[PDB]
Design a protein around this ligand. Sequence first.
Ligand SMILES: Nc1nc2c(ncn2[C@@H]2O[C@H](COP(=O)(O)OP(=O)(O)O)[C@@H](O)[C@H]2O)c(=O)[nH]1
Ligand SMILES: [Mg+2]
Length: 166
Amino acid sequence: AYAYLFKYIIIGDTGVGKSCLLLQFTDKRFQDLTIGVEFGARMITIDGKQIKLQIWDTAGQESFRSITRSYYRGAAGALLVYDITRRDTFNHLTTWLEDARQHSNSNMVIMLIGNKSDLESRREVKKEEGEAFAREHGLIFMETSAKTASNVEEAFINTAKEIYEK
Ligand SMILES: Nc1nc2c(ncn2[C@@H]2O[C@H](COP(=O)(O)OP(=O)(O)O)[C@@H](O)[C@H]2O)c(=O)[nH]1
Ligand SMILES: [Mg+2]
């Protein structure tokens, strides 16, 4: 009835900041890596209700270009991350998105994340390109910095609000 558990997965290319977004959200710190068993949790509040976010970092899946069924199983939300300094990470979004289409529950919320927003001297992908990609595919989008915490809390909380309100 009254308390909630939302399973999240974090997906996207190598080095986009999946691990750092996890650690920033759960521990408020920015930095070992146990592939296949790399996770964290944090309690939040939406509409006065207690919601436990159980969050899975899918590092190690990148080489496969696909997410194992056990990550998708019961996943309520997914953060699909690219690295704004590396256009190739932006280019591979459609293949991550198709993997999710084929193998995830259609109700799984997906938020598009352009990470490393602090790195303005190396930006390759404009914020507007992330926005347009998200619109075309019916997703919410935010730029984050796992380094500075910018929009990190907002990304996880807004995903949860979308899951809860759907
Ligand atoms: N400046 C900056 N560096 C970041 C950010 N997120 C991650 N990094 C750096 O990028 C590297 C890769 O991030 P990581 O979380 O390990 O990527 P992953 O393979 O997707 O898990 C890290 O070692 C950090 O040095 C960010 O928001 N800003
Ligand atoms: Mg990782």
